[PDB]
Homo-oligomer: A and B are copies of this chain.
Amino acid sequence: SNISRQAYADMFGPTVGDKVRLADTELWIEVEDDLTTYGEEVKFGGGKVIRDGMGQGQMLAADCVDLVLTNALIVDHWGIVKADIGVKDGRIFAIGKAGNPDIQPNVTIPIGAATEVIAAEGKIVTAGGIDTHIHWICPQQAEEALVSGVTTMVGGGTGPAAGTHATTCTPGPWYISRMLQAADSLPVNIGLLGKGNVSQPDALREQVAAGVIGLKIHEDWGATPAAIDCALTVADEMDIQVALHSDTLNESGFVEDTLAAIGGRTIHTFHTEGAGGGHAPDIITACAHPNILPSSTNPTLPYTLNTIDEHLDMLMVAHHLDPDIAEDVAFAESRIRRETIAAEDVLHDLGAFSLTSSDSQAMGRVGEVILRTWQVAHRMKVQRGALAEETGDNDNFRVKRYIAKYTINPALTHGIAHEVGSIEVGKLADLVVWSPAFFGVKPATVIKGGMIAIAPMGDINASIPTPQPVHYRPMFGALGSARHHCRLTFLSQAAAANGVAERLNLRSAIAVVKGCRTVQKADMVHNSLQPNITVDAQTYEVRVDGELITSEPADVLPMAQRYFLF
């Protein structure tokens, strides 16, 4: 028959041309396409469509999906579309039209007796976030991140030890082995980074052979040209990634010397703006190079009225610096610059910076990677208007550019994009379901490897799952053996071949990293700009092609006081 558009949206979620506001920001997305056949949408419930002989077919388990997310509004780097999502064997099976081919047309995702249903009508579905700057200071960080919508965590550490407080390094075979074993207990995919600060190759090869998927070069362990060259030489031969925190003190040379030491080899530069570490005051100029994959940590995102004030003491504790030692306080101050902090936001909007990350408990907030990425987008739309790439009256392109920063780009940078990072067929089913009013702030459901791992849950004894108090609680996907089956422990190709998984008796699924040496700035989705950027040595002013890059500090931000109790 016929149905009005509003009534339609209320029943099945929005369709082509409808717009949805992201949380309480000024960003609006418009549905670009809808893969359904009007009148044939599948809906579950009392007397609905998904029932025997109707929306559910007679096929065996092998011929139908294990899980279907009905009427989902997908937001990914490749599009903003309405479709059903089929999951089979813990992986994304298809994005299309679900149902029973026996009575329905255009069915690409068959529903059968073996199919579970998650109703996504009116909800936005995204890939799970990937944070590549984790300091394993405490295990509780994994739950915090999972709850925020982050399903993969790459970093290093051994617990609350001075070395880990300051750097993302899991030093040596013994600690690496121990942390790989401990990782089986966490409900997120994990990959470890070893200490790359050494001028003896074999000391690095041992760590890679033990299991790390990358090497962290940190100034606290000596970010010298010799150490940098050594780590990159080993990375080139073992197909692992190098993450850099440069020499802020300019002790061994200036930024141009470090860049020269890198010699055009692939490298991921952490907190490229500089507040979190790096040649003062021009480490930000690294985003101009083709071999540099640049990321920001989150406390400087976005530039607000209280940003500068909180940074000094945060800096000190994170790096074991003494406020009574003049040289210690002078180098802390040389890292905090209003000029580079303001420019960073714009560089993200332009696609010059390609990733966002936390820098958990070492000048960063583990549960705020996604939230802050969207606050930057909002602030940039408000200040700069539409991007040159926008088409139509929506912010679709800006949304695709920013979502890529914490999903596909981090995946490409670290060689794990073949497993996770986006909603594409064959990738692990790490999905996050959001209600539009809480997008980027508080998820409705977090799915790991095809099983729900954490979600808001009301009174356990209640007659329904909705009564208060409603707060995040671990689900079956986070339990014992089911967890092992639904998470991945990433290893280097050498570790995988050496039988590290068998030796340590790792219980989780194993994935191997590859393609870390061949990625370049041009490969970063929607964020491949290489600007002719300069930093004034005296004033710290950032300029691109001579024009001054800057922005204004926010006094109030969305996704803040309206959602949190504290």
- Residues of A that sit less than 8 Å from B by CB: 10-11, 44-48, 50-54, 56, 58-61, 66-67, 88-90, 112-119, 136-141, 143-144, 158-166, 171-175, 178-179, 181-182, 184-185, 194-195, 197-200, 202-204, 206-207, 219-222, 224, 226-227, 248-249, 251, 299, 310, 314, 317-322, 324, 327-328, 331, 361-368, 445, 450-452, 455, 457, 460-466, 473-477, 479-482, 485-486, 504-505
Contacts and interface: CB of A to CB of B under 8 A. Distances in A.
A45 B166 contact: yes
Contact of A320 (B45, B114, B173, B299): B45
Given A52-B197, A461-B368, A178 B482 contact: yes
Contacts of A479: 139, 182, 185
A313 to B, nearest CB: 9
Given A45-B319, A455-B159, A299 B463 contact: yes
Given A46-B220, A185-B479, A314-B464, 6 more contacts: A52-B221, A52-B227, A61-B173, A113-B198, A138-B460, A158-B451
A10 B325 CA distance: 11
Contact of A161 (B118, B171, B219, B327): B118
7 contacts: A46-B319, A113-B194, A138-B465, A144-B460, A182-B476, A366-B460, A367-B460
A60 B181 CA distance: 22
B251 A47 contact: yes
A58 B195 CA distance: 12
Contact of A174 (B114, B143, B166, B473): B114
A461 B365 contact: yes
B140 A473 contact: yes
Contacts of A485: 178, 181
A171 B114 CA distance: 4
Given A54-B222, A61-B174, A227-B52, A463 B364 contact: yes
Contact of A116 (B161, B184, B226, B310): B161
A191 to B, nearest CB: 16
B473 A138 contact: yes
Nearest to A11: B322
Contacts of A194: 113
Given A204-B113, A206-B114, A365-B461, A161 B473 contact: no
Nearest to A203: B113
Copies in the complex: 3
Contacts of A219: 46-47
Given A58-B198, A60-B206, A221-B56, A463 B361 contact: yes
Contacts of A466: 317
A395 B473 CA distance: 43
A465 B473 CA distance: 23
Contact of A140 (B11, B166, B184, B460): B460
Contact of A113 (B61, B158, B207, B464): B207
A481 to B, nearest CB: 4
A196 B565 CA distance: 44
Given A45-B319, A198-B113, A479-B182, A51 B222 contact: yes
A467 B35 CA distance: 48
A319 B310 CA distance: 49
A436 to B, nearest CB: 18
A249 B48 CA distance: 11
Nearest to A227: B52
Contacts of A461: 144, 365-368
Contacts of A504: 481
A408 to B, nearest CB: 25
A482 to B, nearest CB: 4
A307 to B, nearest CB: 11
Contacts of A175: 66-67, 114, 116
A50 B113 contact: no
Contact of A58 (B53, B199, B206): B199
